[PDB]
Amino acid sequence: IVKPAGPPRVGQPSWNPQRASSMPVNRYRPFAEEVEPIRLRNRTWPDRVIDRAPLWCAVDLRDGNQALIDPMSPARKRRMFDLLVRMGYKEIEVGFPSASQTDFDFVREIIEQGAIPDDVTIQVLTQCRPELIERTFQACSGAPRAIVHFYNSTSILQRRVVFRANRAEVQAIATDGARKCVEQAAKYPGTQWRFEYSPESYTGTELEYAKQVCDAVGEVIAPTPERPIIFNLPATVEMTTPNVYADSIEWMSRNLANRESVILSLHPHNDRGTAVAAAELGFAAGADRIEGCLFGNGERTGNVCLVTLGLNLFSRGVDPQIDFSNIDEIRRTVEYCNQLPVHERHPYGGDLVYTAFSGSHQDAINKGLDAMKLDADAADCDVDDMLWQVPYLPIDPRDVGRTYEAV
Amino acid sequence: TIVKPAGPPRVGQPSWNPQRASSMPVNRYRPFAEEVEPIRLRNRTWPDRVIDRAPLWCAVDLRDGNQALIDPMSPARKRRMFDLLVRMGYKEIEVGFPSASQTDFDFVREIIEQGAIPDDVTIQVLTQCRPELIERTFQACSGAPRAIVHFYNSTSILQRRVVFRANRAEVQAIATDGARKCVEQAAKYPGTQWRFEYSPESYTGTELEYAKQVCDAVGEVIAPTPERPIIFNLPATVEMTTPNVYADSIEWMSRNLANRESVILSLHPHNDRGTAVAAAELGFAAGADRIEGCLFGNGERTGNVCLVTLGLNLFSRGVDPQIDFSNIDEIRRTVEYCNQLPVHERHPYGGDLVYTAFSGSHQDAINKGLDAMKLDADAADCDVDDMLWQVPYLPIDPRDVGRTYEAV
Ligand code: NI
Ligand code: NI
């Protein structure tokens, strides 16, 4: 590590003695130049406070599992599915069955053994090739309902170096995929098929082009308000600040064709550590649905954490529609399934998150707790039912089955 | 155990959404507007500003971080951490709470007596506003070439009621009597370049009009100038709401604080809602000048804003953080040795699995990216390592932080 020794910036205040590092910043461009500048005029998300739960989709079983050093065994997968069901999740990603025999086997097992509750819709991932799309539908044979999630990469970079293809050609991959899904659904009546499309690497894709591909896919699928389509907009790489994600989401929500037949879905990764914020801002921008994992498992920096998002609603008086009353049981099961720890400082579930080491903070917390008890008596009430008013502790640890520890 | 929510759906909930009401006691918690106040900011500008320079960084690892540890830093571990922060490029370094902690007092004496403080570094000390605590704080720093004395008192609606059982005027007088005492003490210790920092502690639970009033009053006592500014540090003591509302509050303060060109507006965002990084970046775009955090987000409970993520979030979009992160492994080894707590596998930039790809499709795309770069390098008689980084799925060249891509 070499102490930066370059000169200060032109106009750097004299009280800031920081120096230029020799890091190769020239290999990297501001988001506006790497992709495009902000399309969004008259944004409204900064003025909208979340007042309801989104539709949650848990991707722990596929998008999560794919990220593991030690892949989930059949037993760990069933434990994860069971946990997700008991928590209250209604859409659950279960595999990439056309590319993974173990995914394929798991899908068959839950279908054939009657593991799927009537209000749960399994989700399967597929790429656009016709034979992979056929294998996806076959895996799901006998399912009473399923979401077939088809996708292809739309970014400026991937169009150039991966596909070596223009805009029309890349759009045709997606529309040809949708046409195949329509053909296959007709071949398999009696499963209620639902569709989800992602312009993968959406955050690296020009918005007008993202809207174009989605609109075209929608034309083929012909969704209706009663049989909507999911357009899921992934931050495949989280590329800039979460305000710009949210602006993009609002622009899409405002401008996509047939909007009232669209479930607008978010899938934010954490490359810049701001996945939760992108999700929360993006939800205020008009999204309908969020794809994440318990404790934010997923490749590299991971998926948006469903626990942090859920309890961020609860702690501001909004029902997440999910049972978080035993976070310890959630946490044990997750660590068992993923064979990877929940960090000590992880919001709501980490080892240290209901501890106070500071003496002043310990004093203040006791004042807060003693004053609540005093009020409980002066109202003839159970303190446990009263408005939580304790300095330093955003929630009563007992509402998630945890305990405050003065250390 | 865990039981499937079975309460009714919300009024208006679409029939495609089968979710039901849980028995979580949401009635015990109020929206932020009701718990504190609604947003004061009109015509916000932060949503339209992209960061184009590094903030003044302040590293609080040695006190605010150390306070969070299961196993307190020994003198050797503290020196190691201080050495890292210096070598990385940090110019303001919190070193202790010497009036509350004899082992802090000992560390502050050690660095001053032994001449450990680099010539471009200002040590930061924390104190509460009791006069005898303030006196002991200046005595701790006796001999220092320069120092920030950071005094604070809690200003939140909640703490006024249940902690201080006091009104607005009275809580403001705590802060101003604190300021007066610091002015008296600095006149008693010539030679040391004394600087001040004031925090309305629990600012996010405090009404903005009242946070401005207290800061303004403190400012009146200290009498800062553009040549001798004051730091007003605005902590999200508890992160209470979304990062846009924190940023709106910073912008409102930066607009409205008296004597703004003699103020260094500093951020201290915690991670209760998992949005500390966002709160810091949006808040910097709102007009802040300075950010207080720790390497790898160490700090009580969910911790402090991560300095590494904030720094690398600047580098990866073409802005020099003015900090050296060329060997992130070295930083991480030292952090884990000093804190005796791990960097998570998925921690941005530094975690074990951040330069890994398991997906077969991503692996293919990564190879295509890397192959096309080399053909462009060779095309232009350039070194591939000096060229614009263009690899699907990998925001930065792992080698720019001394790491390696691994296809697994
Ligand atoms: Ni993902
Ligand atoms: Ni802190």
Curated annotation (Swiss-Prot), chain A:
GO cellular component: cytoplasm; extracellular region; plasma membrane
Keyword Transferase recorded: yes
GO BP: any one term: L-leucine biosynthetic process
Domain of life according to the entry: Bacteria
Cofactor(s) demanded: Mg(2+)
Magnesium in keyword set: yes
Keywords recorded for this protein, A-Z: Amino-acid biosynthesis, Branched-chain amino acid biosynthesis, Cytoplasm, Leucine biosynthesis, Magnesium, Metal-binding, Repeat, Transferase
Biased composition (Polar residues): 13-22
Catalytic reaction list: 3-methyl-2-oxobutanoate + acetyl-CoA + H2O = (2S)-2-isopropylmalate + CoA + H(+)
EC annotation from Swiss-Prot or TrEMBL: 2.3.3.13
Gene Ontology molecular function, alphabetical: 2-isopropylmalate synthase activity; acetyl-CoA C-acetyltransferase activity; magnesium ion binding; manganese ion binding; potassium ion binding; zinc ion binding
Domain Pyruvate carboxyltransferase: 54-328
pH effects: Optimum pH is 8.5.
UniProt-annotated stretches for the region N-terminal domain: 33-350
Location relative to the cell: Cytoplasm
Domain notes: Has two major domains which are separated by two small subdomains, that are themselves joined by a flexible hinge. The N-terminal catalytic domain forms an (alpha/beta)8 TIM barrel and binds substrate (3-methyl-2-oxobutanoate) and Zn(2+). Subdomains I and II (separated by a flexible linker) make a three-helix bundle that packs against the C-terminal domain. The C-terminal regulatory domain includes two variable number tandem repeats (VNTR) in this strain. The regulatory domain binds L-Leu (the pathway end product) in the dimer interface.
Subunit structure of this chain's protein: Homodimer. Remains a homodimer in the presence of L-leucine.
Protein name as catalogued: 2-isopropylmalate synthase
Residues of the full protein shown: 19 to 425 of 644
Swiss-Prot record, chain B:
Domain (Pyruvate carboxyltransferase): residue spans on this chain: 55-329
Binding site for 3-methyl-2-oxobutanoate: R63, T237, H268, H270
Pathway note: Amino-acid biosynthesis; L-leucine biosynthesis; L-leucine from 3-methyl-2-oxobutanoate: step 1/4
The protein's enzyme class: transferase
pH dependence remark: Optimum pH is 8.5.
Cofactor list: Mg(2+)
Region of interest (Subdomain I), ranges: 352-407
GO molecular function, one term: magnesium ion binding
Protein family (similarity comment): Belongs to the alpha-IPM synthase/homocitrate synthase family. LeuA type 2 subfamily.
Record-given protein name: 2-isopropylmalate synthase
Organism field: Mycobacterium tuberculosis (strain ATCC 25618 / H37Rv)
Shown chain mapped onto the complete sequence: 18 to 425 of 644
